[PDB]
Coordinates of C-alpha atoms in Angstrom, one line a residue:
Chain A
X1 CA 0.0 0.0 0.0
X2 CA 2.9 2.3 0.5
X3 CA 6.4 1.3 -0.7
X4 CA 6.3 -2.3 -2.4
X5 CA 2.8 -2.7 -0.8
Chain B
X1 CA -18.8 13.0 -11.7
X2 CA -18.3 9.3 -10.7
X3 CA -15.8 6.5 -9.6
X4 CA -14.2 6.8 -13.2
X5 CA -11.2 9.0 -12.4
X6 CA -7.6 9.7 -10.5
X7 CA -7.4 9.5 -6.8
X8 CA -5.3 10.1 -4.0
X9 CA -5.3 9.0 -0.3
X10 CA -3.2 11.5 2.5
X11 CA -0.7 8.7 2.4
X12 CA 1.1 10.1 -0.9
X13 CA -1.1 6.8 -3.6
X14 CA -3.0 7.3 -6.0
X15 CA -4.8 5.1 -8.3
X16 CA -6.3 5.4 -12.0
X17 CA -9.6 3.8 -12.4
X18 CA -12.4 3.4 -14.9
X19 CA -15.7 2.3 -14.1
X20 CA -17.0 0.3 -17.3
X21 CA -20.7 -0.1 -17.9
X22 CA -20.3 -4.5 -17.2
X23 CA -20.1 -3.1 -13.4
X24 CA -15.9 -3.7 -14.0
X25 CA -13.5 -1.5 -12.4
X26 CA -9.7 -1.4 -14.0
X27 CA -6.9 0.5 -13.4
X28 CA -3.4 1.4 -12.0
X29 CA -2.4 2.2 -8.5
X30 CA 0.8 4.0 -7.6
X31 CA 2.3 3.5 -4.1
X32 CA 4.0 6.7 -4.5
X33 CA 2.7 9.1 -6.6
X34 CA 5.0 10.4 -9.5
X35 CA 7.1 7.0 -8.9
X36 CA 6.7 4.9 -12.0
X37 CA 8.4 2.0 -10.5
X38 CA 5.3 2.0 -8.0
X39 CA 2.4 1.1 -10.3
X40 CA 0.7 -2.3 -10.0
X41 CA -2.6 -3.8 -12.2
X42 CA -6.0 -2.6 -10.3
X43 CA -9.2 -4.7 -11.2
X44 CA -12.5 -4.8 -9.3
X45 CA -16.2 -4.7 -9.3
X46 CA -18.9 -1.8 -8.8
X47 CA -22.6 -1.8 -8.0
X48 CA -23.5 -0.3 -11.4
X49 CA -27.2 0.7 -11.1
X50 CA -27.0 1.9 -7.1
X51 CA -29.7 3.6 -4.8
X52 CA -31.0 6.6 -5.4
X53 CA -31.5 8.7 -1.8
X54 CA -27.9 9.4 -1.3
X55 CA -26.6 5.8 -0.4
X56 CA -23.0 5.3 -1.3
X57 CA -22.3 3.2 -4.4
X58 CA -20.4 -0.2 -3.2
X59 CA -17.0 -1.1 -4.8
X60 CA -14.0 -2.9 -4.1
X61 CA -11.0 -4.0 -6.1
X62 CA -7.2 -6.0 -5.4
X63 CA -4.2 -5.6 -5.9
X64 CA -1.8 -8.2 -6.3
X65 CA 1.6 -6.5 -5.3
X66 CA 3.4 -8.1 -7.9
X67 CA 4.5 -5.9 -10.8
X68 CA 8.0 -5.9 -13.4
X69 CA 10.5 -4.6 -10.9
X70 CA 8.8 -5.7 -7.3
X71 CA 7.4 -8.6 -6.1
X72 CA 6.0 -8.5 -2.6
X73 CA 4.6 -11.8 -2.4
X74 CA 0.9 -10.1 -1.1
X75 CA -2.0 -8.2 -2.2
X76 CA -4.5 -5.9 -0.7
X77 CA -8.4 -5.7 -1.0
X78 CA -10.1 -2.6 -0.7
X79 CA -13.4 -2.9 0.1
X80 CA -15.7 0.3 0.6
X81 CA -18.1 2.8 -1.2
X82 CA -17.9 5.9 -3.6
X83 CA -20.3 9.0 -2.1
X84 CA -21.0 11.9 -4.2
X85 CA -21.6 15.3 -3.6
X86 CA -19.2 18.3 -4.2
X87 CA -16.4 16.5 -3.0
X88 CA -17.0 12.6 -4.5
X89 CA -14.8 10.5 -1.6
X90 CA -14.4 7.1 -1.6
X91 CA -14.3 5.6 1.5
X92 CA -12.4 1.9 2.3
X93 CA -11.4 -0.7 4.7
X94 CA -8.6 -3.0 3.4
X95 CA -7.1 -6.5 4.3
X96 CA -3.2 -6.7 3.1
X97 CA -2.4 -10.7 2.9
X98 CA 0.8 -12.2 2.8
X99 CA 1.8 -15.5 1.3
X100 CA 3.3 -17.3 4.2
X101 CA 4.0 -20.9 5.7
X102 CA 1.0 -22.2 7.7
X103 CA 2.9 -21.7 10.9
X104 CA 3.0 -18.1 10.3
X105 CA -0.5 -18.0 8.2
X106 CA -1.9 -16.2 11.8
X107 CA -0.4 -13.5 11.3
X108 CA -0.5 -13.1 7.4
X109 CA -3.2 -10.5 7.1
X110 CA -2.8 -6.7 7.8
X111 CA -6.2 -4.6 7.9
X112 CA -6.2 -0.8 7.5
X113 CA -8.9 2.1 6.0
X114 CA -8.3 4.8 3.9
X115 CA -10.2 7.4 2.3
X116 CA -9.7 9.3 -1.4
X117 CA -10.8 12.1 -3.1
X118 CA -10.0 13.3 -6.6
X119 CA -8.1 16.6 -4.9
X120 CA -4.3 15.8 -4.6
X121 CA -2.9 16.7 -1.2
X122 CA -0.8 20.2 -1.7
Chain C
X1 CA -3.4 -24.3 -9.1
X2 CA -5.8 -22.1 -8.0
X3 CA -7.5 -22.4 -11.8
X4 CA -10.9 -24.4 -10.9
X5 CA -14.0 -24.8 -8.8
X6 CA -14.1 -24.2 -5.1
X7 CA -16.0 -24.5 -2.3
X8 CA -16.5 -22.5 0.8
X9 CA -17.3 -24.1 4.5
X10 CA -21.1 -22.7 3.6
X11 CA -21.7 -24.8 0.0
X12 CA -21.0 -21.4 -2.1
X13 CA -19.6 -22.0 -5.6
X14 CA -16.1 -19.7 -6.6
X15 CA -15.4 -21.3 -10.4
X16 CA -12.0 -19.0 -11.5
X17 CA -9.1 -19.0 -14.0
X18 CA -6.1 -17.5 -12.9
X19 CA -4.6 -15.9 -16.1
X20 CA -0.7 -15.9 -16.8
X21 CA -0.4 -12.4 -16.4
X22 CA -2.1 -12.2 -12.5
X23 CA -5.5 -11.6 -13.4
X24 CA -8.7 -13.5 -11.7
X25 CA -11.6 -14.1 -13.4
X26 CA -14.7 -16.3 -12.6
X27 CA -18.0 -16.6 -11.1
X28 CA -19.1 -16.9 -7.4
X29 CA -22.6 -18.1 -6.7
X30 CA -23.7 -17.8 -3.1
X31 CA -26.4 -21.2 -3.2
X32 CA -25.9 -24.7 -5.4
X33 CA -28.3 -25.2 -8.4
X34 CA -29.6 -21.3 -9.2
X35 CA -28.0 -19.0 -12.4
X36 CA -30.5 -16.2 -10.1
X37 CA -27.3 -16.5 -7.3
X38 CA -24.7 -16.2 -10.2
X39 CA -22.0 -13.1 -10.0
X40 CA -19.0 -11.9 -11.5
X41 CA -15.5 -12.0 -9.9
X42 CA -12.6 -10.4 -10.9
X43 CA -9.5 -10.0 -9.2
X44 CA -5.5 -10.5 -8.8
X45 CA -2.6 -13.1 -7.4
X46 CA 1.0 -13.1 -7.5
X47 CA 1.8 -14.8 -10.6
X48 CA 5.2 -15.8 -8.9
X49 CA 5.5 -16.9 -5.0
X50 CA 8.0 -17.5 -2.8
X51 CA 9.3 -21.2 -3.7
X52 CA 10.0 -21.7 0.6
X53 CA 6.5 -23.1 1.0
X54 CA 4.7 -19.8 1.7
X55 CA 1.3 -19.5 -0.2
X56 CA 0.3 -17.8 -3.1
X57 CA -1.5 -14.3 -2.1
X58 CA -4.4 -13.3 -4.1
X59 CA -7.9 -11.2 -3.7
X60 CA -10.7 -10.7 -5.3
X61 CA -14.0 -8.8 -5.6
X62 CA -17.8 -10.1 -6.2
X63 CA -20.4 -6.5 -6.2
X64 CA -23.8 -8.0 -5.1
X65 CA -25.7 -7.1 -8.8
X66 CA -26.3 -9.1 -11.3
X67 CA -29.6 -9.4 -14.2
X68 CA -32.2 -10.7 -11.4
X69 CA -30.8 -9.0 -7.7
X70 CA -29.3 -6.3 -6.9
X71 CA -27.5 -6.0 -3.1
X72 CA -27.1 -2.6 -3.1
X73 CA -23.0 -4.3 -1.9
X74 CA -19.5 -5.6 -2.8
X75 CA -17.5 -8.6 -0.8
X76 CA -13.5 -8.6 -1.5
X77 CA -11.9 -12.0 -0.1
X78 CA -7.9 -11.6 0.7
X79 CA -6.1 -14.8 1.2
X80 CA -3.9 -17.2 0.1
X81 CA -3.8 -20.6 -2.1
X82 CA -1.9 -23.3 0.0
X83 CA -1.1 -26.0 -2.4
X84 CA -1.3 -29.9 -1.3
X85 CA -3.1 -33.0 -1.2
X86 CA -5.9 -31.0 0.2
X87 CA -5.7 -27.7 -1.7
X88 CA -7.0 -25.3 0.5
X89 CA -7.6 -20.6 -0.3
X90 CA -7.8 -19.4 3.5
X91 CA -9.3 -15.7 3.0
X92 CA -10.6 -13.2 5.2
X93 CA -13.7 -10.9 3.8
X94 CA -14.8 -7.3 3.5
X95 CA -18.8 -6.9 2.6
X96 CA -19.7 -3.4 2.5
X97 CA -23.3 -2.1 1.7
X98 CA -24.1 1.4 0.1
X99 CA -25.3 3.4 2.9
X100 CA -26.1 7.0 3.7
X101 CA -23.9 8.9 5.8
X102 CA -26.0 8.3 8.7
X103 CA -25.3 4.2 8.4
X104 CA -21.9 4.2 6.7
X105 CA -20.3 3.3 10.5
X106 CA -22.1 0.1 9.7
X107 CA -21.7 0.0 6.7
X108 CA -19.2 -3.6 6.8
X109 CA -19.5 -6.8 7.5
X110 CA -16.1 -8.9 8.2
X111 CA -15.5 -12.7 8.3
X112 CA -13.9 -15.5 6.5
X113 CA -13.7 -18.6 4.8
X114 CA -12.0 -21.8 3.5
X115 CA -12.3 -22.9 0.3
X116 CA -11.7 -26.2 -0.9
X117 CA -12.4 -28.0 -4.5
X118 CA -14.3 -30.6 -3.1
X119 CA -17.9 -30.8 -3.9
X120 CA -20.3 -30.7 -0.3
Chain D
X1 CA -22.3 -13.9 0.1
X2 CA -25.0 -16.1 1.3
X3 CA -28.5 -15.4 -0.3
X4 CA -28.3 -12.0 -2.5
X5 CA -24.3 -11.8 -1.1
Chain E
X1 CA -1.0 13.8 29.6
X2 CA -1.8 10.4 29.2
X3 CA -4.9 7.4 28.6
X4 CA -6.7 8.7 31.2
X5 CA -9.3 10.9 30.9
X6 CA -12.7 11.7 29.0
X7 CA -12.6 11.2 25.5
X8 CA -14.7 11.5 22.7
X9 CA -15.1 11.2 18.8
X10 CA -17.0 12.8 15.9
X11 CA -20.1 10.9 16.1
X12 CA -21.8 11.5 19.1
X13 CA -20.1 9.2 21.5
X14 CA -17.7 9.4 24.8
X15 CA -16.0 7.2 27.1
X16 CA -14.2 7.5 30.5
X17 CA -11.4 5.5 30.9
X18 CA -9.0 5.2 34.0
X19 CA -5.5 3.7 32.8
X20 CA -4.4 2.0 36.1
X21 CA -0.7 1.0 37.1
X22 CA -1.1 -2.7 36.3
X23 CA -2.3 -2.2 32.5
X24 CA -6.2 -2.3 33.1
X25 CA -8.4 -0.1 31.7
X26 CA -11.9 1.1 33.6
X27 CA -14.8 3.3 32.8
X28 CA -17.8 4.0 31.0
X29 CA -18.6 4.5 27.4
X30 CA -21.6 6.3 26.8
X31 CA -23.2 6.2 22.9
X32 CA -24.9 9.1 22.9
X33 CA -23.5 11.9 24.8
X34 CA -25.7 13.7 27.5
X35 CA -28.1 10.4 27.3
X36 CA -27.5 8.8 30.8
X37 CA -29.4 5.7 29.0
X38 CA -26.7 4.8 26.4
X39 CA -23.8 4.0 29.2
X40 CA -22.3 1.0 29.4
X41 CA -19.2 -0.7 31.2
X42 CA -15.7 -0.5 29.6
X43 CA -12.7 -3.1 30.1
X44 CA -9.7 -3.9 28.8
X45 CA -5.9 -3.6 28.7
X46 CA -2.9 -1.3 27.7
X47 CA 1.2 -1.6 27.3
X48 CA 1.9 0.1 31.0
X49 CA 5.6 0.4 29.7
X50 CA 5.3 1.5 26.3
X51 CA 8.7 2.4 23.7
X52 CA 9.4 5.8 23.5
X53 CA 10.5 7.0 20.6
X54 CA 7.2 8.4 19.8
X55 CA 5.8 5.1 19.1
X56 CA 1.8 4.8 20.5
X57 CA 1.0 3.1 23.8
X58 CA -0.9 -0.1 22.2
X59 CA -4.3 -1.1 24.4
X60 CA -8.1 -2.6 23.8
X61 CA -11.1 -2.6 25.4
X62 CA -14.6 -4.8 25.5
X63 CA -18.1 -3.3 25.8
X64 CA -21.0 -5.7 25.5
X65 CA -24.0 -3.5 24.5
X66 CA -26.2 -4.6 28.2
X67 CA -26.8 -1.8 30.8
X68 CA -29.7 -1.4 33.1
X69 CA -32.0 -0.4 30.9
X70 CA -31.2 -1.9 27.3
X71 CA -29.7 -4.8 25.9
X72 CA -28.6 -5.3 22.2
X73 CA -27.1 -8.8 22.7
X74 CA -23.9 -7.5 21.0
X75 CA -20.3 -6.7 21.8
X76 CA -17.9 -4.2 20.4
X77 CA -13.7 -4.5 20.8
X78 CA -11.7 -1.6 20.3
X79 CA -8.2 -2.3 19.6
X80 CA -5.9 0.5 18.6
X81 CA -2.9 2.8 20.3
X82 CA -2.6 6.1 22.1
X83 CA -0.9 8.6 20.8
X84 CA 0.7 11.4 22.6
X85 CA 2.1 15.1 21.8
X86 CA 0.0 18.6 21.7
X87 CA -3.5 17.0 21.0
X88 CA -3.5 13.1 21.8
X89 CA -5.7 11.0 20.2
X90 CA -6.1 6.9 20.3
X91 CA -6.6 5.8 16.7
X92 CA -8.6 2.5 16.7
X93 CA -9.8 -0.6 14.5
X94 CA -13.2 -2.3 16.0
X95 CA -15.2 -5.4 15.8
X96 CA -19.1 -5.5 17.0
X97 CA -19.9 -9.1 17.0
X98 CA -24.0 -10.1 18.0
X99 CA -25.4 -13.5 19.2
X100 CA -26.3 -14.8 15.8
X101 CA -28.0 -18.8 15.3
X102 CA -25.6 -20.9 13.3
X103 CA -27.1 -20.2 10.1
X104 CA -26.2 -16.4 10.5
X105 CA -23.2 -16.4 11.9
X106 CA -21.4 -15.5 8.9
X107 CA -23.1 -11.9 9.0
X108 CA -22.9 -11.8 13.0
X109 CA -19.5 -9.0 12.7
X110 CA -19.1 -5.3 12.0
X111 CA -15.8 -3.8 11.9
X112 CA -14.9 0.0 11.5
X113 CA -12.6 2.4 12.8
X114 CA -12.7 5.2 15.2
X115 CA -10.5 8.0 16.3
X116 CA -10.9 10.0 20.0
X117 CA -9.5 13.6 21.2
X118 CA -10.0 14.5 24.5
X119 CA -11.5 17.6 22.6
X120 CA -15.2 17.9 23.2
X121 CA -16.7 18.4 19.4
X122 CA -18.4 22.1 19.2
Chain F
X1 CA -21.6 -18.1 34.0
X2 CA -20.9 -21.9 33.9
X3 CA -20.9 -22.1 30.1
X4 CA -18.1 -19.7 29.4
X5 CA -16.2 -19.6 33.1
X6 CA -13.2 -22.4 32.1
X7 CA -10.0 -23.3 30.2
X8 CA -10.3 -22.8 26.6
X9 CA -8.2 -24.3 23.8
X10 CA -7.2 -22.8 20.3
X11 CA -6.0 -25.6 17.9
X12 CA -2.8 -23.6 17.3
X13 CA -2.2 -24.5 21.1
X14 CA -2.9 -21.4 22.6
X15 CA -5.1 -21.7 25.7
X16 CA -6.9 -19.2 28.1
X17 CA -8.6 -19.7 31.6
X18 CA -11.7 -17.0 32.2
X19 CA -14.3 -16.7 34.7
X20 CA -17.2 -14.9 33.4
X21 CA -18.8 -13.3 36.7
X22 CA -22.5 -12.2 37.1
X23 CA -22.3 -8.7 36.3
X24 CA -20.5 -9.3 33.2
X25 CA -17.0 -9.6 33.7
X26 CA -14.1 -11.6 31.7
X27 CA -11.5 -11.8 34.1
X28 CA -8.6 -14.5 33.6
X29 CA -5.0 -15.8 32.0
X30 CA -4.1 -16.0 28.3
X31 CA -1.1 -18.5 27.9
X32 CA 0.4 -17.8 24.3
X33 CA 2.5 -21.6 24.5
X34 CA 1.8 -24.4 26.4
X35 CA 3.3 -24.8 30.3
X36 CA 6.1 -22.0 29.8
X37 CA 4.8 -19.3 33.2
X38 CA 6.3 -16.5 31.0
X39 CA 3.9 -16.7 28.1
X40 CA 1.0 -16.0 30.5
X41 CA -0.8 -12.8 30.2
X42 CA -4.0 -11.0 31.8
X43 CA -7.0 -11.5 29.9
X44 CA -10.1 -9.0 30.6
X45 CA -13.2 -8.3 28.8
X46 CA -16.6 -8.1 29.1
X47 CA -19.8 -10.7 27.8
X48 CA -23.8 -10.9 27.5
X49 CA -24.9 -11.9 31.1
X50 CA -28.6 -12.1 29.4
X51 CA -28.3 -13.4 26.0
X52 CA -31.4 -14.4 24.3
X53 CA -32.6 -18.0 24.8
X54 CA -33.7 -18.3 21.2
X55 CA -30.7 -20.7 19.9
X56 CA -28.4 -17.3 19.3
X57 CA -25.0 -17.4 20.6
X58 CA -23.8 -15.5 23.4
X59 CA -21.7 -12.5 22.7
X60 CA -18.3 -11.9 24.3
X61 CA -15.2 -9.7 23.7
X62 CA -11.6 -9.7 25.6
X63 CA -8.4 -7.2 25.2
X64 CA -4.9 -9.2 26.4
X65 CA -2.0 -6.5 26.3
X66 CA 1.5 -8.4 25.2
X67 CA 2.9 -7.5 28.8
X68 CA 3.8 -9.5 31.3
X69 CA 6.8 -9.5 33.8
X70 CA 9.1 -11.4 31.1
X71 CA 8.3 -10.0 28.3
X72 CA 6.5 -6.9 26.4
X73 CA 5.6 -7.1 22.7
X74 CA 4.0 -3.3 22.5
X75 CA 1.3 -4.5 21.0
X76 CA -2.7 -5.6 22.1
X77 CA -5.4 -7.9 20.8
X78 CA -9.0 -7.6 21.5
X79 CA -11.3 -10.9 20.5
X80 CA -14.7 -10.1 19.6
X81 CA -17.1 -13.4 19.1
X82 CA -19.8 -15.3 20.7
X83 CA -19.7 -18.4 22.8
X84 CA -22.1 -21.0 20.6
X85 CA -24.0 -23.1 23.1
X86 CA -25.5 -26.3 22.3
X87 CA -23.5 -29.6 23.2
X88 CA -20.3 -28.6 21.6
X89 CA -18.6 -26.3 24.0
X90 CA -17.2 -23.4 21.4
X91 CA -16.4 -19.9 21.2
X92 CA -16.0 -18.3 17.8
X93 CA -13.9 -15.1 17.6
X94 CA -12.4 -12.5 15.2
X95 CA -9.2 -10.7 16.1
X96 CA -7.3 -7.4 16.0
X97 CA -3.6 -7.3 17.1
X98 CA -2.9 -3.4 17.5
X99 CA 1.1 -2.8 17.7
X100 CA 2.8 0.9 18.8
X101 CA 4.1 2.6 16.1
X102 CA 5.2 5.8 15.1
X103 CA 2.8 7.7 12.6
X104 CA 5.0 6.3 9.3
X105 CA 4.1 3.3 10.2
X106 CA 0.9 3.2 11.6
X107 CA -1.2 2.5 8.0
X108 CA 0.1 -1.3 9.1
X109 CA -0.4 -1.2 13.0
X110 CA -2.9 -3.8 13.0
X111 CA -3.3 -7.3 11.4
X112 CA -6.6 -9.3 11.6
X113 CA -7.8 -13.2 12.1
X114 CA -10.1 -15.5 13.4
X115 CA -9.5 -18.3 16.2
X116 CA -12.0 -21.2 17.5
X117 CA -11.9 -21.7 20.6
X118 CA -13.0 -25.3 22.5
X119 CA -13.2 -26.6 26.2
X120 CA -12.2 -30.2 24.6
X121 CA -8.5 -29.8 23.9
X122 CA -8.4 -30.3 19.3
X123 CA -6.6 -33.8 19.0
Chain G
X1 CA -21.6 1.9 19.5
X2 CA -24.4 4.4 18.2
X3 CA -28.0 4.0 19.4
X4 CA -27.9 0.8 21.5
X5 CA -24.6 -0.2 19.9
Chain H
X1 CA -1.7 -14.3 20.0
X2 CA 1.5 -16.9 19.1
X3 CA 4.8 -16.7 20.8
X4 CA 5.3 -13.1 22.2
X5 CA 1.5 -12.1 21.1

């Protein structure tokens, strides 16, 4: 959701 | 007016939807807005014919967080509704699952909320 | 693979293809024998897991509407396809209704459920 | 999910 | 400064809370407020030695929805963390789950989120 | 309340002891692994001391706080569910497990999952 | 956690 | 829940 997610 | 559009959250995403008239929902969303290298495949489902007296319209699409540079072996579902008005909002709760060994499969699922608007943060 | 029919601990039918490039695309119906309790799914996986004996992570997204009902509401499952013997997709659910402000504190339903390909 | 969900 | 106190959020609700030594929580959460009706027993537990970096103070709590006067045969758990600094707020995740037969126990939980001040709404 | 007042067993091997009292109250011990004194943790939560007698489960909610005088994990979970009734003694729960964190990190403070809870220890 | 909840 | 939790 933020970064790789 | 509608779902079909760009978004952002207060969390620096955004996400690139359309809402076709088969009740789909595709799209793009960008961990970190204005980084390329964050965009994943977006694809959900829309209640396309919804009620009329100001009820949101239900939604909800994944994304698998698996793209050509990153592969986070997980994907999130956002689950929620798009409300209209002068400022359209979409408003979610999300469940973050990670593939993991069955030892560890209690604790493989985050859950969160967030909330977008068509208005990027300044 | 997860390609295939499953069923959940409640006798609802998920029939999906999982596409080469990490699309999901099928049908869920919520009770045996009626085309009336037929729906669309779409949704994603990761089209390459771990190889250490993690699961495969995937989601998907069923809106409550189709030619004969309408819901007024959207269920997402996130899980994960455990392969085996006994192939299992341990999800968690989201159901949320279309409410009015009033009612959108309300507004979802959580829960989950096991899916396996054999027939109840 | 069970009935119309 | 700290979880105890009066606290409220932007839908009508309040709750009391006493943070004790031994990482118990006590009070009273009240659904509406200014109806005396709508109060109900509050228990749970919080990290009585929490990091300090500026990390929140993790904690929970349990009311089930029977007072005196009404009984909803329902429970809600709030689960979130306290968070310090010039206007401290605890940021939470809950779950109301209702005696449900067998049959509907698969629609017998809510879940939302809810964020307190100690800042009475105007 | 003799139904719920016990020792309950997860089938991941966690275990818990309660006492429901009459006004209400979950008090009791939540032991994360099996006969180690240092994974025990107070449990306390509240329950339905007047459910309906219609066949409708009993519902129940407890926070336990990941501190104890070993050990201290910053982090909570609160179980919401409902104890079942009928001749199998169960209680069926969701869970959140709330972590400190500083704001960056606070979008994923909190995962989520279910346990089944049973008085007859899963074989 | 409104009304009776 | 498991382990430390």
């Amino acid at each position: 959701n933020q970064x790789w997610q | 007016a509608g779902i079909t559009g760009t978004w952002y959250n207060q969390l620096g995403s955004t996400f690139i939807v359309t809402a076709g008239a088969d009740g789909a929902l595709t799209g793009t969303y960008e961990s970190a807005v204005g980084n390329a290298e964050s965009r994943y495949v977006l694809t959900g489902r829309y209640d396309s014919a919804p009620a009329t007296d100001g009820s949101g319209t239900a939604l909800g699409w994944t994304v698998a967080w698996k793209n050509n540079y990153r592969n986070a072996h997980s994907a999130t579902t956002w689950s929620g509704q798009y409300v209209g008005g002068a400022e359209a909002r979409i408003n979610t709760q999300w469940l973050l699952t990670s593939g993991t060994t069955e030892a560890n499969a209690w604790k493989s699922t985050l859950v969160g909320h967030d909330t977008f608007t068509k208005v990027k943060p300044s």
